Design a binder for this molecule. Sequence first.
Ligand SMILES: *C(=O)CCCCCCCCC#Cc1ccc2c(c1)C[C@@H](Nc1nc(-c3cccnc3)nc3ccccc13)C2
Ligand SMILES: *[C@@H]1O[C@H](CO)[C@@H](O)[C@H](O)[C@H]1NC(C)=O
Lengths: 497, 497, 497, 496
Amino acid sequence: ARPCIPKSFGYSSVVCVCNATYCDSFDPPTFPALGTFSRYESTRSGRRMELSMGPIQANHTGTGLLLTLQPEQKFQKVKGFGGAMTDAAALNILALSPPAQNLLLKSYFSEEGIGYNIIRVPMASCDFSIRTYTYADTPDDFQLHNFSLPEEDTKLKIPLIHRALQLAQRPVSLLASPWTSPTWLKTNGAVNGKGSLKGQPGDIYHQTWARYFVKFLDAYAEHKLQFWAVTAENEPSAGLLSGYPFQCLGFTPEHQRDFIARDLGPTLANSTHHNVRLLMLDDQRLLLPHWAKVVLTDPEAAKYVHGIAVHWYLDFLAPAKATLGETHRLFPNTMLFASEACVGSKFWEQSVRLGSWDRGMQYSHSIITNLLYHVVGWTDWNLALNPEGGPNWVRNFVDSPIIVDITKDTFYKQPMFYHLGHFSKFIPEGSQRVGLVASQKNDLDAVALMHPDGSAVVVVLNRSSKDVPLTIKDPAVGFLETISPGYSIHTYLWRRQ
Amino acid sequence: ARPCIPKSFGYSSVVCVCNATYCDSFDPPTFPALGTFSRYESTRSGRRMELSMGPIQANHTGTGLLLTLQPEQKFQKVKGFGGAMTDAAALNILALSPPAQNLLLKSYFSEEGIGYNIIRVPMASCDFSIRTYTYADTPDDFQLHNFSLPEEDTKLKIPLIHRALQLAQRPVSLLASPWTSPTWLKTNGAVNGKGSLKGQPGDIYHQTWARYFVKFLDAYAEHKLQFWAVTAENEPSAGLLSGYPFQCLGFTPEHQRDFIARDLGPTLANSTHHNVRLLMLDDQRLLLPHWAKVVLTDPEAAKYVHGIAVHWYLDFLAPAKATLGETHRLFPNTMLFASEACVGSKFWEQSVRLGSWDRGMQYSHSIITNLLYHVVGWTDWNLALNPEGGPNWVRNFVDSPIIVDITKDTFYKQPMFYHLGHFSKFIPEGSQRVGLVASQKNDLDAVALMHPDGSAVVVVLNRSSKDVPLTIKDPAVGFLETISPGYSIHTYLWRRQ
Amino acid sequence: ARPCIPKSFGYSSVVCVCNATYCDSFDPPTFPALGTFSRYESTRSGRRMELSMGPIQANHTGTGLLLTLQPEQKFQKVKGFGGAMTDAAALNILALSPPAQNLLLKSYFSEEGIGYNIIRVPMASCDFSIRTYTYADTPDDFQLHNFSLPEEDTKLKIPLIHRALQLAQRPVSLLASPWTSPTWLKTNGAVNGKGSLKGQPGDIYHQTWARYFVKFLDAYAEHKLQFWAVTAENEPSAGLLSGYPFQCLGFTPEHQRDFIARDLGPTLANSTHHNVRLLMLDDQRLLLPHWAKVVLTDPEAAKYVHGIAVHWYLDFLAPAKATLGETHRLFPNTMLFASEACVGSKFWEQSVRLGSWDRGMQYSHSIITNLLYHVVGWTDWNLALNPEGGPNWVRNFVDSPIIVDITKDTFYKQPMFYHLGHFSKFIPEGSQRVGLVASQKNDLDAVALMHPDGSAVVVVLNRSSKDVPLTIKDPAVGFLETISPGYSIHTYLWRRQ
Amino acid sequence: ARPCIPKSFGYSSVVCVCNATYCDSFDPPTFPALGTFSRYESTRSGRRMELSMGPIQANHTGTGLLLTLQPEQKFQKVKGFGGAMTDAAALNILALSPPAQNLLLKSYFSEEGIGYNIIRVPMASCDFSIRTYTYADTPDDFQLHNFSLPEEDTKLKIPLIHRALQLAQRPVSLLASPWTSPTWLKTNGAVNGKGSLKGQPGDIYHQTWARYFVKFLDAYAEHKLQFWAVTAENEPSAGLLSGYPFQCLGFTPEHQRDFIARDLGPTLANSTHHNVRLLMLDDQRLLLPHWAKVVLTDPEAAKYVHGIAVHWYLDFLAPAKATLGETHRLFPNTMLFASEACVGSKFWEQSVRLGSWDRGMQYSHSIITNLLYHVVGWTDWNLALNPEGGPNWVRNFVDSPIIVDITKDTFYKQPMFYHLGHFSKFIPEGSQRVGLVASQKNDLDAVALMHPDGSAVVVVLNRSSKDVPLTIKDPAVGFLETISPGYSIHTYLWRR
Ligand SMILES: *C(=O)CCCCCCCCC#Cc1ccc2c(c1)C[C@@H](Nc1nc(-c3cccnc3)nc3ccccc13)C2
Ligand SMILES: *[C@@H]1O[C@H](CO)[C@@H](O)[C@H](O)[C@H]1NC(C)=O
């Protein structure tokens, strides 16, 4: 319907400019005829999810690169894709005028945008907040009589989540994660730093903390919001680190195992929110398979754990095969899910690089690798940030797919938005990864899935500078002849019946 | 009750450190016996409103400096003293834990603090806000059907104002001032820059703007808050300047005259808030007496104008005698009131100088000069700021008497707090300035007033480095023998019957 | 010869990219035939001093805008245009490889560039320095035996000035200005802050300071550099301001009058550098005509003062007519000269806005207004800065027409460069402003001059978004039919005989 | 001779204020009589290396904490202590008037100060520079005909190093480290970012880079300065990182091994500067023992490597035992040396915290831990910085033990200065760490050494808030009865 308004800020590619009266958008999804394929293309040179069509040909000759679909090789089913409604994200969105707000929300959540079906919701404050608060800051309130949702939830996050669900055509799943407990439950008596829950699993401290989860779910339920899942703690390894600068709560794998078994599991199961899934880890995949072994070999813990949530920050130390692959081999009925990722947090690098194609490629490369190693979903961090990469009370400024400029009632959609969109828009919940084999060695990253209706989807990422001619073979329908330009990402879709 | 915990940040004096469990405070006011005086002393060296007592002596010999009270020379009556509940101030206060918040509010508003009886409340956003908003941003809403108070008022400012009034023993007067109108009422269609109300006094634009004042008062009344006064516009000269960087609305004196006469006056008088006072100017005293002449010689305007509000920012160009003095001589029944002051806004100077004695002296020197030229009250700007002197969306960072450090649940009371306190605590509403004459030339600044009950109050400021021995003669009671140390401020109190 | 390589950084227009092997440049100046005009055009849309030609027509009909040249209405003669060789500028230039350096110097100083004929040279350190040195820091050296030029002059500034003069086809005039004296000559004993020369005019402190000027001129003369002029002090009002953050030396107008009369004038006149011109003020035009009255009504001072130097920073408070116009009316034989301007120092703006058309328009609007009110030249501040707008030891970062990126051996020519070039390239020394009248009210800014050879030059600036059709009438040659596009600047040239 | 002039800037403790006519200083070292001990004390409350004395007692009774010297348990010998003469440090020192400059240099280098005997010298520009130069920026000069020292070396660094050596009573050792090579030797063609030397070890690129080291040493030798050591590269891991913001040159451990073996080692050994030591790593101790294994198991490399230089920045991820301890166990004849440390680079802290006792304790805790795990020296980063923690061309502003205020001709000596001084002043080169055992579990950090003359030195750091009564037993002389106050550091000295 409406194309990208490009704008360059001196980095490798452009952002797309949106405001109160204009944002780039798609037409309603059309299902093209059998024998034809759809291609969506984004390039470093400036193309943004541009729609073209072509014939699926009966015959193919040549020695070029062939990618062959293997529809009978079936792997994981997809839960979905999305991002995080932090205080910072909510503040930035609400800094826009209402019509601009709606265009931003439509960009993420509607079929005229990229069709997000996951929202991650922090349980109280994190570093992407303007103050340190929990839901129960009144000291020594073990009964949680003074548990309440502050303005951040009731005026910022909750109304935006409602508006997002109203705009979405797909069912949206909410995922909750806590950073810190109330400080009076902690060994160090502070929101940050090295510190765990006081005492031991089973006791009042741990039972109060478990009950805080239920209190959270109750309060959100009173606001007509239900959660698909919760995590046992955001990045539990962080709270084991001396001087950790922002909200954390430390758990060893054993401590998490026992907390799940003795407190969190039973308390959730004995509540009105017993259908809510519990995800473990919510931390770096370097910690796998060890963390999964420790927790899931205890059947008292394992019976409460639906899945394993992973963050991307130490992926460079942790090959996917040895972590994700090995965890799946050992525990094939426990889903693997990517729950957080952002660029810009490395201490030496710039927080926000407006129009960075490299950062887009990091997102799409990560999603592909995750999908090739059994992962069922992928979740961005902050949905929106300001040009500094904030607000953030500890100055841990990072990048986001959408950057909001409050002073100009304007927002910028980065390459990250579109790279994520190449998956989120075209891989609905219940899609299944299928086999895809290359005829020769190549520099492309690619994944193939089948939608619930049987139609095919293939994403092809070219991180090299060289254009790669290629053919996609579907045994049922024929051959898709195409080119993968240098510094491009393509999504291919076609009917198989 | 509790002394100052001093802390130095490398400037000329100390701040007083407060937190969740400790803040410096006074005992309840005792009325000492006839024949004795109370002295409160603050010094650059570290004393903070320290209480001592002494005898009033029958006789006095010597050639030393004599200040002689003239109780029959009567001048203006005092309305009061206070500061501004901006979005920035409210945000900073609410960044503290609740017990720390209460200690801050007690510091300003209780008799255990400095007894503020004025709070200035911006009507919607100013530069000390995190976003630009008015109460009626829905375009062309001349009816003001979509007028509403956002979270800044309902969750931040209003609850804090309630809590302040609960802590105050004296009646607190609220003063409201707008920075900008909705942009659709303005010639330039923006919150900032050179721009006035569209059209002319009498018309729909001006009637809508007048009605916005009533809508504001209604909304605050629904929250159980009544206003003593409103100003016709914050700094109307600012909106006459090309490129003025933050929220403004330009009025010439003629435009303000005609707006008051045709729109604002009648609309207020014909409402349930007809008892609310209207102050004019709310701008630099350099604009007097001209601005007062233009407005108050029109009886159609003059009949609605209770007083003239002045800001201190161009005082260096505008001698008090020729501005305040001359305005009083011409219009003696129209009160002069100081409605805004802050240090740190000069483009070349540091915004926040923690522990600056110089900035304290600027406050007390200004208050004295104002009181010596018919001014009935003096109002600080932001009640609290962060260590950067914000938040502020245009980076117009300035200083404040209280600096809040969110990361340490701590606030710092600056010399400005105490210099203001030397007046606010000891000069209740209805006090009257009286004569005070020096026997010889001196470097001190001094003012004398009488409380409603007839008791005396004298403030003595020494901005020199030399200790000045002095005597205060009251003809009724006798002689107060004392010393004014270098870089000190003293308040003296005594019964006369 | 070589066009602009455009590059966008997200602002309203483009920069032109230069490096070791490429920079945009002009062909040698051609003099087109009588009956034809040359037009050089720069636009927000991307045109950079593009050459076109057209006929001067015999007849003209229509009701459109007519600008009529009045060649017999003669006003001031032009000294020239240029910028400042600060320590920061020199460091940034020398950060490039030698071939890139030469392309930068050629851009400014050659006839293949924009033909600068003025270089302003600070006398020792200012804020655009990496340290706070004077030429005589050895304490109490009233004889100035230890006066010497440090590395900043001998290795950075002086060699670059030589290279600039080698590249220039027009004679280049050097202008010197001091920021601070040695601290041992100052009341405050520091390079910055409120402080003046110790004592009084006539005395040793003032005689030493006067002699420092001669010592400076001697040292530069030993390096084969002669000065056209010196200023009595850079921004003398700055040293009257408490807490002024960088190098300054305070003078009231009286103090400057008496310093010139008693010390600086006589010392210069009695030296080998007696032909060097002395300019007064070197400060904001808001200070005129008062400052000119105070100095020039004393004949003992007036006889040493060739001219009055003005800075642009408070132009928004100081209409040209009432300051520049009035000063000229009173003192028509004392030239007015604009000695410093930069954008980016306002706290609410970015220091550097790469590709800002607005900033270009500020330069050309200022130059036109100055030329329309008797000003004989206009001088930019730093010739080059880094992308942060530095280096600057007090963080007073600002913009510059050329921004150097050290890590890429690249420099960027901003719209400011071209807006300044529209004058500097086409208004040689000795050109004379002549009359130019508009047939009706309009939004254009325009000025007409005559070169020494009698040829005409007209600059037309359009700061509006509307294209303005217009005609220029020269009674001697005929009618130039043209359009002034929105957000454009044009320079028109033609022979009159 | 002259006490600290204290000044508070709102942090946990005071700085000591110095200017053109005043700086705090010590009297000449006295050697007190056998049977007595000297104690130097610094406290958070304001004491700055204050001298007191007491008796060594014949007998001791009680259940209190006993620290027992074990003079026959001998460990590493100490090379020394010091800091870095960066462009930023030099500029800040030279911003002072000459008499103030001399008081600053005396503070660090004289016996009236804290007796530094190491100066680290960057080879051309780093982040603590005002511009991005190398010694050979003329392109493709593989012969290095246009190699030269710019103004930063000849007018700032070299004259200050001369002045420091003149003031020093102990021999001073110079240590050189490069950040980047000329850009025309690099794969990325830039001073910063991800990039290594072009080609492979053995080739012209690597031979030129090796020759640059010799050219550097030659040029400094022409200015009458000799180096004790050089490092193979400052933080070689940095140049492996995409977008690394300042001067770097990337080496894997294999690349460094092969560069040392094929180029740097042979070129140094075949020059007039063959006695100069070569240190490897010059990077985070997290990289050990792996990096040491990779390099030192190749005898072609190992034969050129005198020692291993470590930086402290990732110490929080890298326990000393598993890194320093394990490296020493594997390679006991290869010295471990701490070549760089500074506080203030973490994004969530202030770069400069004037008067921070915490930052002092970080220095002394680090030095003790290093000394307890075989480390032979400890080197601070910038010798002086401005109040912003600069100058620094990429805004990587950090803290320094001395902060110079140019506008007031004043400098501030931080707790870091004194915490470092508690070791540097009292642990001369050739001192040997000896055993020291605690009678019970405690919160103190302590180390014992013996000077070359046989006299004893013990440093005791108390990072807790609790005063700890304690006794030091020397079997030869007797018992030192003392107290370690909360938030204190003590150095004890005695003849044996
Ligand atoms: C801008 O000129 C359009 C009008 C803006 C609307 C009014 C703004 C009010 C609040 C403000 C501000 C502001 C205004 C002007 C300047 C600055 C802040 C910074 C200043 N830069 C500047 N000033 C001086 C100077 C010295 C002594 C006396 N007057 C001015 N000198 C400078 C030297 C070098 C660089 C910047 C300087 C202008
Ligand atoms: C200053 O000049 C004198 C000679 O007049 C000379 O002896 C002295 O060394 C010079 N330099 C300084 C720093 O005093």
